[PDB]
Nucleic acid binder design. Structure first.
Ligand SMILES: [Mg+2]
Ligand SMILES: [Mg+2]
Ligand SMILES: [Mg+2]
Ligand SMILES: [Mg+2]
Ligand SMILES: [Mg+2]
Ligand SMILES: [Mg+2]
Ligand SMILES: [Mg+2]
Ligand SMILES: [Mg+2]
Ligand SMILES: [Mg+2]
Ligand SMILES: [Mg+2]
Ligand SMILES: [Mg+2]
Ligand SMILES: [Mg+2]
Ligand SMILES: [Mg+2]
Ligand SMILES: [Mg+2]
Ligand SMILES: [Mg+2]
Ligand SMILES: [Mg+2]
Ligand SMILES: [Mg+2]
Ligand SMILES: [Mg+2]
Ligand SMILES: [Mg+2]
Ligand SMILES: [Mg+2]
Ligand SMILES: [Mg+2]
Ligand SMILES: [Mg+2]
Ligand SMILES: [Mg+2]
Ligand SMILES: [Mg+2]
Lengths: 60, 133, 113, 75
RNA sequence: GCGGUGGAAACUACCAAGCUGGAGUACGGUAGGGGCAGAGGGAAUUUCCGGUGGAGCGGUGAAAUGCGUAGAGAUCGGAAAGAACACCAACGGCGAAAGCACUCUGCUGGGCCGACACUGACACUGAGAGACGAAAGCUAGGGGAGCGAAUGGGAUUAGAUACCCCAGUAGUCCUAGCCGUAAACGAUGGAUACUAGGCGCUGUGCGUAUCGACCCGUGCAGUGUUGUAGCUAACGCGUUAAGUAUCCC
């Protein structure tokens, strides 16, 4: 069903914001129905983006 | 595979206790001779050889289940004796005999492998490989 | 196509203050391109996306002592091939500048999922 | 290229990876994870040498004089 | 039993040459909180400097010590410092074990898989010996927010050298060492072989599915839960044995 066909990075914000919560929390693998490999790569990505202020830790 | 003989023996004992007629074993002068002898005593149905990638396999057919698998009166026992740790030898007058002679004792002697029967006929002692019930 | 001969592939993002002109920006560009090429970079490929509002407010102190509180930012993107040895100074050399508010560099691995 | 499985080539590859590891073990002294590996690989090389001493005396002495390997501990 | 002599040559031993399936090497892949070092990050907390405001805050089973009109707490704006890394996180990952998780880069240890590319038994274990080895502890120099032995006050109680509360020093942190002990636990030494399945996961490989993500079936390598044979004093263990055997400690 849902899948990643495009290279996932910290700069594809559309992608990463799918897998982020309203509060900017990272959603679990069981929810996102991703292979473990994927999920890890997402996670690190999100953190990197978070540091570069592409996505917020907390909200306004 | 520190001991090859013991291992063959074991593969039999195991396949036997699990009610399978068919066993794969790895062949060798020793293995082959022992199995030959096992056949001429009649503890085992049939033997044959196979080859692949320069490996030899003797497959052994085994005596069928005793009038079902659940009700077994008899199993087929095997026991290693002379083993790498302690090698047991015997002269002619100590040659073992198993359960009054119901079972058999395998001997490696100067004239090759045999049972205790042969050893008694020819008057020879030697290294005792294993016992069989 | 990209083909490094005994080099490592890299990406680097830099975040700069929004109060900058295009000449000061291109001067920074020029400068860092030169540090890379002076460090043994074959293929310096630079790309720019400027002026986006940040996720959050960041603070940068200057050499003039200014406390600068930002909202927007200038993102510079660098694909380049440098020896693993030479990536060392670049990062601090980016930290040290007052114009570069947030720097980060990543090694790039081939994706296989 | 030559024999990549030959005793002498292997012992070389080992001696070389060890003297290489030596620099890292000098710069970062707190890395025990790496040292444990060093000790392992040195063990391997030492084994091969003992083996080779058993099999061929000449090739052995030639080798440990060639690769500057310290003389054996059987003396 | 010892000694001499004449024979046998299977097995152990010896001698000469061979062989890969055991053990390795190269080659190409790929996952990873392995380790050491160097950069960078944000919440939260504490204190300090201000503006507002103006009687209680804080705490407990209920209280009191305590903090507060010398303006506390609350709230907004500043700085500064240390320590720990929310979500991801999972009956998931790597590690010899101890343990390892914000991010990143660099130096490096292993693992596993597929191919004959190669060597050809180079194996397994290990008395002594060596290295690593939670936390507390110690020596020397730094560092000191929070927590907190000791200690002090407040209670509770016949008593309370305790539990609870209010404070709070060593220590916790870093560098360089020493110490070598833990329910250091799977309470399960290591290697090899061999003996039903069912349901799962992690890594890869193959065939299929499309010609790129699944998908399926499978081959390995590890990891988890039920359970047959067999084992056990029972509980239970059950291809990751506590089963059937061999070797060393
Ligand atoms: Mg005798
Ligand atoms: Mg005599
Ligand atoms: Mg012979
Ligand atoms: Mg030989
Ligand atoms: Mg901050
Ligand atoms: Mg206040
Ligand atoms: Mg593991
Ligand atoms: Mg590595
Ligand atoms: Mg040869
Ligand atoms: Mg010991
Ligand atoms: Mg020590
Ligand atoms: Mg400690
Ligand atoms: Mg003391
Ligand atoms: Mg306290
Ligand atoms: Mg008291
Ligand atoms: Mg306190
Ligand atoms: Mg220390
Ligand atoms: Mg003890
Ligand atoms: Mg114990
Ligand atoms: Mg599926
Ligand atoms: Mg397995
Ligand atoms: Mg269990
Ligand atoms: Mg079970
Ligand atoms: Mg037991």
């Amino acid at each position: 069903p849902i899948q990643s066909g495009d290279r996932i990075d910290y700069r594809n914000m559309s992608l990463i914001s799918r897998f982020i919560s309203e509060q900017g929390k990272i959603l679990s693998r069981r929810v996102n129905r991703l292979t473990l490999k994927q999920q890890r790569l997402i996670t690190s990505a999100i953190k990197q983006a978070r540091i570069l202020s592409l996505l917020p830790f907390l909200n306004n | 595979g520190k001991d090859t003989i013991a291992d063959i023996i074991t593969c039999i004992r195991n396949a036997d206790m699990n009610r399978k007629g068919t066993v794969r074993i790895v062949s060798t002068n020793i293995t082959e001779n022992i199995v030959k002898i096992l056949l001429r005593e009649g503890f085992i149905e049939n033997a044959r050889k196979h080859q692949e990638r320069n490996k030899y396999f003797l497959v052994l057919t085994l005596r069928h289940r005793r009038n079902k698998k659940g009700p077994y009166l008899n199993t087929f026992h095997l026991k290693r004796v002379s083993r790498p740790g302690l090698r047991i030898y015997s002269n002619y007058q100590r040659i073992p005999r198993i359960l009054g002679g119901m079972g058999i004792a395998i001997l490696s002697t100067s004239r090759g492998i045999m049972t205790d029967r042969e050893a008694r006929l020819e008057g020879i002692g030697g290294e005792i490989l294993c016992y069989i019930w | 196509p990209q083909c490094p001969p005994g080099l490592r592939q890299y990406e680097t993002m830099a975040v700069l203050r929004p109060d900058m002109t295009e000449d000061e920006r291109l001067t920074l560009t020029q400068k860092y391109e030169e540090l890379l090429v002076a460090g043994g970079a074959m293929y310096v490929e630079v790309f720019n996306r400027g002026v986006i509002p940040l996720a959050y407010s960041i603070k940068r102190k200057n050499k003039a002592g200014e406390t600068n509180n930002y909202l927007d930012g200038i993102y510079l993107l660098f694909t380049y091939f440098t020896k693993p040895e030479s990536i060392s100074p670049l990062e601090a050399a980016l930290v040290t500048d007052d114009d570069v508010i947030r720097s980060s560099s990543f090694k790039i691995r081939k994706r296989k999922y | 290229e030559e024999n990549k499985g030959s005793v002498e080539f292997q012992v070389f590859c080992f001696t070389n990876k060890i003297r290489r590891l030596t620099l890292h073990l000098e710069l970062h002294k707190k890395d025990y994870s790496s040292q444990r590996g060093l000790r392992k690989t040195l063990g391997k090389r030492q084994r091969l040498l003992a083996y080779l001493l058993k099999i061929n005396g000449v090739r052995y002495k030639e080798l440990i004089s060639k690769l500057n390997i310290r003389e054996l501990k059987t003396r």
